[PDB]
Amino acid sequence: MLKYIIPTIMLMPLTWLSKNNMIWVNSTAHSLLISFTSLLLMNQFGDNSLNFSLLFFSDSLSTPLLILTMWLLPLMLMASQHHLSKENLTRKKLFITMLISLQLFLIMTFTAMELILFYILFEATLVPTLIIITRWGNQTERLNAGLYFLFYTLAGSLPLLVALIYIQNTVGSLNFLMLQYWVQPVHNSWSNVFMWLACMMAFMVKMPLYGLHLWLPKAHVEAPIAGSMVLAAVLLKLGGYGMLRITLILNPMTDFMAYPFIMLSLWGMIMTSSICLRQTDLKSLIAYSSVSHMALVIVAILIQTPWSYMGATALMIAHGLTSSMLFCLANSNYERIHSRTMILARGLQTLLPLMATWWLLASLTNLALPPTINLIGELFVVMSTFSWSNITIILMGVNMVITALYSLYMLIMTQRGKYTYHINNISPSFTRENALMSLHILPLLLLTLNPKIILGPLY
Amino acid sequence: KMELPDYKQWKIEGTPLETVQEKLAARGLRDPWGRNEAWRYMGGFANNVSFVGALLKGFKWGFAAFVVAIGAEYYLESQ
Amino acid sequence: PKYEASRLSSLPTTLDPAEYDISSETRKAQAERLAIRSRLKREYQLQYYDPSRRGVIEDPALVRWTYARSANIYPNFRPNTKTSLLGALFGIGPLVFWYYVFKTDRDRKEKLIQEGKLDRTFNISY
Amino acid sequence: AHIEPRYRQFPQLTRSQVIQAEFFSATMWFWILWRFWHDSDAVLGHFPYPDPSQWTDEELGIPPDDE
Amino acid sequence: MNMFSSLSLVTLLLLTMPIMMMSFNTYKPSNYPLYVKTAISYAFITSMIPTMMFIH
Amino acid sequence: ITKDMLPGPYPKTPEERAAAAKKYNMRVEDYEPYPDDGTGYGDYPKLPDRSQQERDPWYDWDHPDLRLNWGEPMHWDLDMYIRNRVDTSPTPVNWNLMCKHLFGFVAFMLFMFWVGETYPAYQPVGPKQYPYNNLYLERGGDPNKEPEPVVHYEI
Amino acid sequence: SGYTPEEKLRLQQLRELRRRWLKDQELSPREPVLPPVIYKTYRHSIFAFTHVLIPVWIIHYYLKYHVTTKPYTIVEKKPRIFPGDTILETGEVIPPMKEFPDQ
Amino acid sequence: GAHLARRYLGDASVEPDPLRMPTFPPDYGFPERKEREMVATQQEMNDAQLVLQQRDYCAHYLIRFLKCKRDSFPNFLACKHERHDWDYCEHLDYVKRMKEFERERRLLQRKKRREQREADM
Amino acid sequence: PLTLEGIKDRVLYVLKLYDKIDPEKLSVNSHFMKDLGLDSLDQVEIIMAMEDEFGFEIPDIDAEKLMCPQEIVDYIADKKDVYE
Amino acid sequence: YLTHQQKVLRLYKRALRHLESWCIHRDKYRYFACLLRARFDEHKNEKDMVKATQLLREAEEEFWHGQHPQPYIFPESPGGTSYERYECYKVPEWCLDDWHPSEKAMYPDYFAKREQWKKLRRESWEREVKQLQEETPVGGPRTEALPPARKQGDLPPLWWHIVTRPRERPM
Ligand SMILES: CCCCCCCCCCCCO[C@@H]1O[C@H](CO)[C@@H](O[C@H]2O[C@H](CO)[C@@H](O)[C@H](O)[C@H]2O)[C@H](O)[C@H]1O
Ligand SMILES: CCCCCCCCCCCCO[C@@H]1O[C@H](CO)[C@@H](O[C@H]2O[C@H](CO)[C@@H](O)[C@H](O)[C@H]2O)[C@H](O)[C@H]1O
Ligand SMILES: CCCCCCCCCCCCO[C@@H]1O[C@H](CO)[C@@H](O[C@H]2O[C@H](CO)[C@@H](O)[C@H](O)[C@H]2O)[C@H](O)[C@H]1O
Ligand SMILES: CCCCCCCCCCCCO[C@@H]1O[C@H](CO)[C@@H](O[C@H]2O[C@H](CO)[C@@H](O)[C@H](O)[C@H]2O)[C@H](O)[C@H]1O
Ligand SMILES: CCCCCCCCCCCCO[C@@H]1O[C@H](CO)[C@@H](O[C@H]2O[C@H](CO)[C@@H](O)[C@H](O)[C@H]2O)[C@H](O)[C@H]1O
Ligand SMILES: *C(=O)CCCCCCCCCCCCC
After folding, report:
1. Cis amide prior to A208 (ω within 30 degrees)
2. Whether F70 contacts chain J with CB within 8 A
3. For residue J152, what are the β-bridge partners?
4. Which one of A181, A243, A268, F150 is least enclosed by Cβ atoms within 10 Å?
5. Spatial separation of the C-alpha atoms in residues A194 and B29, rounded to whole Å
């Protein structure tokens, strides 16, 4: 992985040694080059994973997450350079360095072979993310969003540290390849119940699990655009990625330990989908929509079937591109009217025709129109949970209905109707904004042509 | 630019608006907007077909074209 | 037959007994309400028609609404009988209901499989 | 245009619309008459419907009561 | 089989072509509606060939 | 927008009530908060629970699509009462009577369908007859076994 | 229930302005200033060549040399065989049916 | 029509059951009863690919009609006589079913009438 | 494609087929009450006849103010963007 | 808000439109419209306000009973089939300010005349604001009514968005 870690590190000196007016041009160009080289990770074999060294490995789960991670960095830079135009040079460079260090921690997190190395990098992501929200967020509530984000995570992550260290003493190793061969069954007992909870609660907060989700709408409403993009596209998937790995060593206890969390997710998805119908804040609506989408991922990971694990991987990738695109769409309005209220600016299709097309495609992916990978992943989970229990099709089906209702409510409210009379600063869409939207949707729709590369190791 | 037909030609006499004028006159009442509706009862609008007549549109020629056809079919049926 | 108003079908204004009876006190209130409306309309129009204004006319009414619908709720929330009873009847009850629905269904199906009575002849995708 | 609007008067018509309308109306009535002359069975039934009460007990194989 | 399966697929491909042209590869806004109508008419003709083979 | 122009806690004294009414651009006699349960309404006014569809369409609204004026207090559930959602307009038929007639019609149909299923219509004919042991082989019967011979006679 | 003297005057003043604004929406003669049967058959022959012939060549090549070279990609319902038919491949003749009774 | 009023509104013990008929032996009151003759063989109906519901005692007329249709293409107004012959064979097949219903009814009536003779005695 | 004179021509045409109005006294400026002797119930019927004529609704608040043929012409012209 | 006379005349207009929805045919409508007029004429000269208000309330109850459940609506009226049909084509005039120079170059004459209107709007603004200030009661405006221009060369205060509003058929 050094062929990705080192060039990522080199982006830091490139930014700092760039001419004053070239920090955005240079960092975007070379972060796009790194993204290009990340396709070499697609050398995945049918039986064995791609095991580089004693530290890093890549398989069909981490590969799409890595390619999404390295793709987001250039997008985040394009999305951030407008509202940062008045910032002084040193602070712009510092902002870019936080984004680069986040990519460094993320690519290492997804390929770490040892679970304690995964833990340290999984926690290292907190620092740059917290700094981005609290330093470059816009409103007073960003300080409280930083604290809720920090302490929710640590509240669950510290028990995980104790459980992982305990596992290493008992088993002798935390190397994931070794755990595949040395794993032993977990027998029922109160000690193993809390070991299960310690192993999983940290990842549940990251998803976030319904009930532990209140930090997420706070973080999004206060975060800058790049903060929201990485939070929604990638950081939430750390929890799903961690669960997909740690569940290996929790069988068969997961058979009954899963039940309370499946009920929270199955009912939570309906509650959070219905909440989206009444949200007044556009960023808060999209943040609540992610909770509904990740409720599916939690259920898929917990029921532990080949179809559900493939659906989870497709859903995690599809949601990342879609949710990030929705934030970028909402932000483009915000940079004009400087408000997040959904009802403030209406009928925008009359004033920004092409931008209204991006809104349509993002909405269509959000409600999982076939054959988008949003639908492929969601359909696979529905197929697998029906076999788990036929009754679940009622909840899954109802959630499909509510999801279409709130996705199109968002589209109809902002794009259709009559434009607000007194809003007269809706300037035409910039090339930067249109390119930013197209760099989300185009890769998303292309992936429909070759879904196998985002279906994970169970494919 | 547009030419409006003379307004004096609109008279209720000889139309069902005259029947209303007699039914109202019995009660002491009178209808002041009668001539405003008279165009709908005169001219090319004076006489419209009944429902049966609307269905039988084209029956006369469809019948003649049919009497010939069966007549021709019978003639060939004897050759 | 009198009109029977409902939550989703308001009483027609023309059938409201209040409207036809207008006292001087009521007419005073109606004038006072029109004074507020006119004052706000002028304050809006002097910005709306300003030729040099490019941007959004901030509406404190809209700001108050979005603020109330989120930020102002917890500070004015009190845990009494009503809040806990609603809080527990719709925040933990559904989870219990679904747990028993799904646990009962899965236990029934697990028993059938273990006796070989559930038909899974062609079932090799899960 | 070729057809100008009128006020309170029957509209101006073209020959083409009137003749084409009459052709397809007479075409319909010829088609119904022609089809009926040949395929009245499609309307009135294709085969006779027997009256079961007119079937003897010999052919139905009903034995006499004293048996 | 070679004529049946080929014509049955050209009907569907023919319908997509006005959509693809609208990516400005060859753009004729002057009478796009006439273009779309013409494509439907040709698709109708080419679909009647496999229909006739089925009826036969 | 200052803190004094934002929603606050439930108004306890008449002086606070007068301040709330002025803050929300309402007459003090018209202003009325939600009940001081623990539901978190604060001092936000409780306005009539009416659809925006019920509002006069001819008046020159500042927001003609919403039928709102700039500065006027928004109903707590304004987003539910937009013209695309819940309508509360008066109806030509009483709400209770509509529910009776709709329910009665559906209930009667369901009953009659049960009757029709219990006493079905059919023609006076015996079963349709098929050759070769009621098409035993065609229907998928096992060739090796022997079906019971189905025999149909002339009549 | 009529206009007041000041309502009449304002309405008249806005009327004059509104009609002058509408008149100014008419385009001048030069606007827009733009930057610098056998025909029927020809236009229909070229449409058939590029929208039917070329696609059918592409599809036929695709089906003949790429799709039908793989098993079970194009599967046909086998032809119906009736009594008295002759099979082309083998030359076999299907027998006629048992003789019908009168009816 | 009429038969449904008798069963649902009148005596139903003397009325045929469409779902259980016949309930009397096919040789009851029928000395030497002949079997129905199938003209088309199983292989002929299998190769003609007849829909299973069409593989009845009139299948030979349907096979002959289907062959004519293919041979007469594109003339789709031909094969009228072949089609009618199949239609007529199906009409007689239906009339036979009508007789089985009437036979069952009269045997049910004869039986109940015989029980009263026994019930009276 | 209405014109200012066209609207006036039809507004007077309708009023000349109204039996309560003398067709010779009627002019564009005739006040319906002061000059033609009609009442407020008559005025409602006139406005309804103008809505039928031009096929669009004049709301009551606006309709109650149209007290002469010229005012109706000005209202219709303004509503339909007629400037010539 | 509405006087007694206003309420009666609105009821008369409303009743006739619903009556017409029932009658459909013109000769039938003319007959029953004259009977309905004669019912309003029976109490035209009723001078007792309490008696008159009683008649109005009962008439409104009688209207509600006999109203058409599906009255005719003019197509462009609120609730009509063409209501707001053309809103999507109504683009505000300020959008032209954001046009690219190559786009404006295609309409040199229109955009020259647009500059004059913007010039007229700029020069008139201060007088409109001044006039509104000096004619508004101390407490604030009591009604939404606006004044005309008083001097030659002055434009009526707050005219731009009325005068330059989109055309009713903007395309
Ligand atoms: C004993 C071991 C020590 C190892 C040290 C190895 C590196 C030593 C580097 C010394 C030269 C640094 O040069 C110094 O830094 C920057 C970066 O070029 C220069 O100037 C810089 O200005 C701006 C941003 O700062 C940019 O246009 C660009 O980055 C550069 O031109 C300074 O004008 C120069 O004074
Ligand atoms: C479930 C596992 C994770 C649980 C983690 C929970 C630990 C606490 C995390 C957030 C810590 C934030 O620290 C503090 O929290 C309280 C409320 O919680 C905030 O308090 C906020 O709400 C209170 C009342 O509700 C106000 O009086 C206060 O003005 C406001 O700041 C503080 O502003 C914040 O400084
Ligand atoms: C969101 C929160 C989710 C919380 C989920 C809570 C899960 C609850 C799991 C209950 C099962 C716990 O694990 C269970 O504990 C009991 C002791 O009580 C253990 O019992 C063990 O010790 C007892 C001592 O009395 C013996 O009698 C018993 O024979 C032995 O099995 C079981 O070995 C184990 O099956
Ligand atoms: C994967 C299969 C892809 C097959 C690729 C085949 C490539 C053939 C390139 C042909 C390019 C035609 O490009 C497109 O054709 C239409 C019709 O012909 C033309 O359109 C023009 O002709 C039509 C005729 O009905 C009229 O609407 C009008 O005269 C005009 O629009 C334009 O020229 C262009 O819009
Ligand atoms: C071919 C179609 C076949 C299916 C036809 C089905 C029609 C069946 C309709 C059943 C529903 C009838 O429902 C019934 O209506 C009448 C009429 O108001 C109501 O009758 C009652 O309400 C009215 C109105 O308030 C009052 O005058 C009085 O209280 C009473 O008459 C009953 O309260 C209701 O129960
Ligand atoms: C005799 O074959 C009757 C055929 C069906 C008649 C349907 C007409 C309407 C309902 C009457 C059916 C009788 C139900 C017992």
Report:
1. yes
2. no
3. none
4. A181
5. 95
Q: Measure the CA–CA gap between F29 and F21, rounded to whole angstroms.
A: 8
Coil, strand or helix: which one is A112? Answer: strand
Ligand 2 probe mutation, A130, A141, A147, most atoms within 8 A of CB: A147
Catalytic residue among I39, I52, I62, I78: I39
Helix, strand, coil share (%) of chain B residues, nearest 5: 60, 0, 40
Q: At CA A404, angle to CA A403 and CA A407, rounded to 5?
A: 80
Neighbours of I38 (CB within 10 A): 19
The ligand with the least distance to the CA atom of H1 is 6
Q: Which residues in chain E have their CB less than 8 angstroms from residue G74's CB?
A: 1, 5
Identify whether I81 is a catalytic site residue: no
Reading the block at residue A440, the tokens are 């989300």
Distance, in Å, from the CA atom of F10 to the CA atom of J164, rounded to the nearest integer, reads 46
The DSSP secondary-structure symbol of A374 reads: H
Subunits with at least 3 CB pairs below 8 A relative to chain E? G, H
Residue of chain G nearest E40, judged by CA positions: G51
Q: A18 vs A14, A26, A27, A93, J23, CA distance in Å? A: 6, 7, 9, 10, 83
Helix axis angle, E32-55 relative to E2-20, nearest 10°?
170
Distance CA A179, CA A159 (A): 20
In angstroms, the separation between the Cα of residue E20 and the nearest Cα of chain G is: 12
The answer to whether A374 and A297 have CB atoms below 8 angstroms apart is no
Show the 3-state SS of chain G.
Answer: CCCCHHHHHHHHHHHHHHHHHHHCCCCCCCCCCCCCCHHHHHHHHHHHHHHHHHHHHHHHHHHHHHHCCCCCCCCCCCCCCCCCCECCCCCCECCCCCCCCCC
Contact check, Cβ <8 Å, G32/J107: yes
Asked if H82 and H70 touch (Cβ cutoff 8 Å), the reply is no
Residue pairs between chains F and I whose CB atoms are closer than 8 Å: 3
DSSP codes, A76-105? HHHHHTTTTTTS-HHHHHHHHHHHHHHHHH
Residue B67 to residue B61: CA distance in whole angstroms: 10
Chains A and F touch (3+ CB pairs under 8 A): yes
**DSSP string of J122-133?**
HHHHHHHHHHHH
E strand or H helix at J141: none
Rounded to 5 degrees, what are φ and ψ at D59?
-75, -30
Q: Which of residues 12-51 of J touch C (CB under 8 A)?
A: none
Query: To test ligand 4's pocket by mutation, which of E21, E24, E25, E27 has the most ligand atoms within 8 angstroms of CB?
Result: E21
Beta bridge partners of A51: A57
* CB–CB contacts below 8 A, E to G: 32
Measured from the alpha carbon of residue H98, the closest ligand is 6
Residues of F with a Cβ under 8 Å from any I Cβ are: 58
Q: Hey, is the C-beta of G22 within 8 angstroms of any chain I C-beta? A: yes
**What ligand 1 atom has the least distance to the C-alpha of A16?**
29
CA angle (G85 as vertex; G79, G88 as ends), nearest 5: 65
* SS3 per residue for A29-76: HHHHHHHHHHHHHHCCCCCCCEECCCCEEECCCHHHHHHHHHHHHHHH
Strand blocks (E) in A73-187: none
CA distances from F152 to D58, F136, F141, H94 (A): 19, 14, 19, 14
Distance from C-alpha of A91 to C-alpha of A81, rounded to nearest angstrom: 12
The Cα of F40 is separated from the nearest Cα of chain C by a number of Å equal to 4
CB-based burial, A436-450: b 16+ in 10 Å, e otherwise = bbebbbeebbebeee
F119 lines ligand 6 (CB under 6 A): yes
Contact A247, A301 (CB under 8 A): yes
Q: What is the resolution of this structure in A?
A: 2.4
Question: How many Å lie between the centroid of ligand 5 and the Cα of residue J65?
Answer: 17
| Total Cβ atoms within 10 A of residue A250 | 21
